[PDB]
A paper describes a structure:
CapA and CapB, among others, are involved as copolymerases in the synthesis of extracellular polysaccharides that are thought to be potent virulence factors. Reproducing the Gram-negative organization of BY-kinases by direct linkage of the Cap5A1Ct fragment (herein called CapACt) to the N-terminal extremity of Cap5B2 (herein called CapB) allowed the production of a fully active soluble protein called CapAB.
The asymmetric unit contains two molecules with a small contact surface area of about 600 Å2, characteristic of packing interactions. The crystal form of the truncated cytoplasmic domain of CapAB is thus a monomer, as observed in solution by size-exclusion chromatography (unpublished data). CapACt also contains an additional α-helix called αA (residues 202a–211a) interacting with helix α10 (residues 187b–200b) of CapB. The total surface contact area between CapACt and CapB covers about 3,000 Å2 and is highly hydrophobic, explaining why CapB is poorly soluble in the absence of CapACt (unpublished data). The active site of the protein contains ADP-Mg, most probably resulting from the hydrolysis of the 10 mM ATP-Mg contained in the crystallization solution. The adenine ring is also involved in a classical hydrophobic sandwich interaction with the side chains of CapB R212b and CapA F221a. Thus, the crystallized protein was heterogeneously phosphorylated, and the absence of electron density corresponding to the C-terminal extremity suggests that the phosphorylated tyrosine cluster is highly flexible.
Numbering used by the authors: 197 to 222, 1001 to 1215
The structure:
C-alpha cells in the first residue's frame, strides 16, 4: 500500500533527490561480510561502492558546497540510521577525511555495538562533565575514524542537547575534524534529531523501502525542513536491488 518504495517515489512523493540506494544485505552485495560494517569488512563489495558514491555526492555534487557535518535521521525506528551512519563514516575515513561519528541517539544507542567499543564514557558523560574530552572520544582501529559513543543513558537527552556544553562541544568538533556525522533517534517520536539539525544545518534522511508509511515519512521530512536545515537528500535502504 503506502510505502515509499523507490527513487520515483522519493522524487514524486517527497520532492527530494536520492543520494544513494542501499540494497538489503546478502552474501553477494556484501561479499559475506561478518558484520553490518560492510565498508570496513568488505571494502571492495558492491554495497561498499554505494557508500563511496554517497560520500562523493555530498562532497562534490554541489560546487562550492562546504558541508562540515551531517545529521543522519529517519521517520521511524529500524530505518537504518545507525547502519548508514557507521558505513558512511568509514567511507569518509577511507577517503582520507579525519572523521568523527557521534552517537547522538542517547536513548537507544548502537554505535558502540557496531564498532565493538566500551560505552562507559561518551557523549552523555562528557556533556555532564563526568568525563573529559580526551577520554570520551575513541580513536578506532580504522585510521582517520574516531567515535564518540553515547555514554550512559541520561534522564533527559533534550536538556543535554540544548545545554551550553553541547553548543561548545559542537564548535570544538568542527575545529578538530574534517567531517562530523551525528547518528540520531527517529524524528516522529522525539525531537532530538531536529535539535541536532539546528547545529549541522545539513540532514541525510534514511528511508526503509521495505517498510514505511508515506504520510509518516512525509511528516518527518516536514519536521526536518522546519528546523531551517537543508535536507541534502534521501538514502533509500533495504532496497530489493
Ligand atoms: N540494507 C540493510 N540490509 C539488511 N539489514 C539492515 C540494512 N540496514 C540496516 N539493517 C539492519 O537493520 C537493523 C536496524 O538498523 P539500524 O541501523 O539500527 O536502524 P535505526 O538506527 O534506524 O533504528 C540492524 O540490525 C541493521 O543491521
Ligand atoms: Mg539507531
Amino acid at each position: 500500500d503506502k510505502r515509499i518504495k523507490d527513487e520515483e517515489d522519493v522524487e514524486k512523493e517527497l520532492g527530494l533527490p536520492v543520494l544513494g540506494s542501499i540494497q538489503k544485505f546478502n552474501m553477494t552485495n556484501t561479499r559475506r561480510s561478518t558484520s553490518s560494517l560492510i565498508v570496513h569488512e568488505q571494502p571492495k563489495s558492491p554495497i561498499s561502492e554505494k557508500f563511496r558514491g554517497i560520500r562523493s555526492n555530498i562532497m562534490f555534487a554541489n560546487p562550492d558546497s562546504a558541508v562540515q557535518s551531517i545529521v543522519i535521521t529517519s521517520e521511524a525506528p529500524g530505518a537504518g540510521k545507525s547502519t548508514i551512519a557507521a558505513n558512511l563514516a568509514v567511507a569518509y575515513a577511507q577517503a582520507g577525511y579525519k572523521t568523527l561519528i557521534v552517537d547522538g541517539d542517547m536513548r537507544k544507542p548502537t554505535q558502540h555495538y557496531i564498532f565493538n567499543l566500551p560505552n562507559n564514557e561518551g557523549l552523555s558523560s562528557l556533556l555532564l562533565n563526568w568525563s573529559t574530552y580526551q577520554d570520551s572520544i575513541i580513536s578506532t582501529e580504522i585510521e582517520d575514524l574516531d567515535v564518540l559513543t553515547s555514554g550512559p543513558i541520561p534522564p533527559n537527552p533534550s536538556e543535554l542537547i540544548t545545554s551550553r556544553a553541547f553548543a561548545n562541544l559542537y564548535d570544538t568538533l568542527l575545529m578538530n575534524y574534517n567531517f562530523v556525522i551525528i547518528d540520531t533517534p527517529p524524528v516522529n517520536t522525539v525531537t532530538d534529531a531536529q535539535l541536532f539539525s539546528k547545529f549541522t544545518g545539513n540532514v541525510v534522511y534514511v528511508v526503509n523501502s521495505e517498510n514505511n508509511n508515506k504520510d509518516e515519512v512525509k511528516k518527518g521530512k516536514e519536521l526536518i525542513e522546519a528546523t531551517g536545515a537543508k535536507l541534502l537528500g534521501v538514502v533509500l535502504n533495504r532496497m530489493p536491488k
